[model samples]
Target: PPHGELQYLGQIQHILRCGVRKDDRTGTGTLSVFGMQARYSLRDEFPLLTTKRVFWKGVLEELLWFIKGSTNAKELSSKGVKIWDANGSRDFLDSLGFSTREEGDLGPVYGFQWRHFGAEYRDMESDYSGQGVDQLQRVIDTIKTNPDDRRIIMCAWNPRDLPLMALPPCHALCQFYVVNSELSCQLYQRSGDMGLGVPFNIASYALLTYMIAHITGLKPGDFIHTLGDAHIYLNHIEPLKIQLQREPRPFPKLRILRKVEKIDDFKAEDFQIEGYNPHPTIK
Candidate 1:
């Protein structure tokens, strides 16, 4: 079977070949493409990238943070995952006109929107239990109760809550589909950072699908990633070109060590990745 990483590489090649030049919010400019789609099968293997190493620990921890409904990046940073640290810094928050908000507090980010969609936004330390609609729980319950429901969606983009957020969510929403006892997910991302962020997003969503499938008694199906504005940053162009030349290694398998009845009960210790051999990091 062909490696799943090829599909990712192909997207890179397409962007390099056909993408137009555009300036971005970060002032990094990019080779931007309007729309793109890629499918990764999750039958028995995980879609962790094999061209360059992906930060699996960060991926796992960030998702768990999102699941826990944490809007504070300090919680994630305290665990040694500093990916969100930049966005949560005092200076960054000040620049976004959030000077009144405390440092390390990202108001109504992905996790907040995931677990409590329409919840009132106070500070990060506020207890939001039973406040807003629990979209994640609703998605799980619908998957288990009415698998045929077309509204099995978990959304992270809230326009009313955007001004309060430190950084807007790139991955806007996802819908889950069930067929023949297999769970499939299709993510609609408003914007994607192809070189650095896309790979992580792919693995993150696949892992989420696996976790949901495990708890809901369904087999993992496909993870379809649909991006609206997929672009490679100017600095990432050379690295991605090099990554495109590397041969893809076999995807590793994810083993769940224990059965967890609730998704919130899952810990980092219960999951393991087997046989993941990938090329060195490009940068």
Candidate 2:
């Protein structure tokens, strides 16, 4: 059996058995748990969960979009990734007190904070060439020059810009570590929607580690996921229970076809999941 996928399945099972009932910000009641950690080895295999088909396209595109410093949901939606379209809707923006901002503007969300940490976000269309701290580049540079530095980190949670955002980041911060010529990443997520979101988070960060490792000339190590409010929505319980029963298959291997030097030069077509035979999606 695949240990990485099983670790995720075990998390669902544990939450079902031990989680406490609680209300959430989305008004979706949940079986919530706190302080959970899962480690996924990315040595030679990827952790694209075998129990269910993860949306590999969205995962790849969304990460690239974030890396490009885009805060417009329309840019992602235009590429057929509608994950952020709901949050970027005009009504949602209005609901979040962003009445003056244009539709699809997500404020200084993940992309802005990652590429331009303290830049004044005028609109989604403004040029942020060299405004604020480029945390992503800083992390990559540190990984190459000073791998032993503990400060190789990229943060998405900005307190000053929280209210301005359409939705606050769930996967808030990630730290990259380099040891023994291997690159590892640890993500500290403030909240996780276990049934739907956790799997994507797992693969996303793992892929991130892989990309950084590739550019830094290091081997991919492990992805450690640390969550604060890990919860399964009440509506997701039944589907999750069904997912837990499915047997996991062998994990897939990711292939990057290009010798992409700059992280920003990576395209979605540059990646290929060699062998991903997962079960059908629950929803």
Candidate 3:
């Protein structure tokens, strides 16, 4: 029985075996290769990995927070997902001219971009309603009424806001393809911290695919990820090897307890994963 989650482990293994070493912007060396693609079928199982236990709750909360179209790091912090801590540091914000704002304010991250891509920015603390194009809403509307449309896409990259942002967007394009009432997604990423960010991103978009499918009255299909500058840190080598050795168990099934009309209405409590037996945490 091939576990869908094991696909990630194999991908890492392939990179390690065949990928050449390269240097990155962090001045830290890396063992890397060209872009790789990974696919997961949402029909039989969820893509949450079983080699090392993935923080599904953190994934859920962070994703939900994004769906809320919020750029507040404090919000994610309150929910106990500390993934954005480093990016939301006061020191970092100060360097970016966001001094007066509260901590954890990622000026306009995924949520802001997903919900309002081209919106003008005065400050992180101001209102953004009636501003910018709502890509998410447009995508949702397309999925519901025009599933066959080739342009059913949602994106997070805003060139106009790139310089003002602390960091430019890496996970850029997301296009939805509907086939026989099933919704599938393809994401094109320009850069990523491949060791950990890969899985986090994999689950995030998988959840997004599932959410859109659920609300649009379609079945969740494949989640395809395409990376541009996929890389692995020099320090990650040993730990990654250890993770590779861990056997992948059966994938857990994600059960949404109640159906909601809108994807934004979903909460962390509403999602439950059953039979998620997996190996110990990597680090």
Candidate 4:
């Protein structure tokens, strides 16, 4: 199969079956399956699983929220999304008791590092606004205009910002490649919660590829996800088992509603879904 959802789903099942379990800060933890490769082709279909109900709209909204570099969960919660709600209240960062004077004093975290951090001021600017966004655009543009530059790379990992972050980056880094005018993206995630988070991450990046392709006039390509610490939490075992027992139907396709001309101009409502049929909800 071109899809890795079944493979990954089976992998998680195996891990839970054979892996060790223990308690930790995130939850009662199980032995992690580190460093896995999950690859899917965007040309075939979007990676949202039809087996169980995948929150397609919530995934898009949360990703846009992250790209907006928001640290607060209130904006996301108000829209009826709650992926990060369980960690604390609506004020997740505040509940953690961390603050940053410049970036809303909530915490030193992903948004601060990914979207707003200064390159010259902190020596970490070369990534996002500098080469990161531009590089991604260049690759897309070239695929349309030039169709020849073999290297089209975007990165999110900056060593300098690691020490200043609240948590080490999980969706740590990514790079794009152009071969024979075909564009593809590979993401390096330092950590992945296989049961809950990986599915969302896959859909998020795949959607990103589609958006980038739309803006640059290039066709959507493949999405390759590489992980460092890919694991399931002990508490998630039953949910995963339930998922495994249930047969996956067909992968859902995503449809963008708005004719967005630029990347920054895109909003949450710009996208919509159709023909999504999944098994049922799992707790």
Specify the highest-TM-score model's number.
Answer: 1
Q: How well is each residue in 38-138 modelled by candidate 2, as lDDT tens digits? A: 98999889989888778889999999999999999999999999999988889988887788888999899999999999888889999999899999899
Model 4: lDDT equals 0.65
Tens-digit per-residue lDDT, 90-152, candidate 4: 354354453322222323245544555444323211233452233334455666665555455
- Alpha-carbon lDDT, every model: 0.92, 0.89, 0.82, 0.65
After superposition, candidate 1 runs with Cα above 4 Å error: none
261: Cα error in model 4, Å: 2.8
The reply for model 3, stretches above 4 Å from the true place, is none
Please estimate how well model 2 matches the true structure, expressed as its whole-model Cα lDDT: 0.89
Candidate 1 lDDT over 70-89, as tens digits, reads 99999999988999999999
Q: Which structure is stronger by TM-score: 2 or 4?
A: 2
Query: Which candidate, 1 or 2, would have the higher TM-score against the true structure?
Result: 1
* Cα lDDT for residue 179, candidate 1: 95
- What is the per-residue lDDT of model 3 for residues 1-283, given as tens digits with 9 covering 90 to 100? 5767666777787778888888887677887778878889988678887777777778889889888887878788888888788888999889888787677778777888987778887665677887888888888899888888999878888877786666777789899999998899999989776677877888888988888888898899999989888788879989989988777787778888998899778888888889988787656
Candidate 4 regions off by >4 Å?
A: 1-4, 17-27, 71-73, 82-108, 115-151
Clashes of each: 0, 0, 1, 3
lDDT, model 3, position 32: 79
User: How far off is residue 143 in model 2, in Å?
Assistant: 0.7
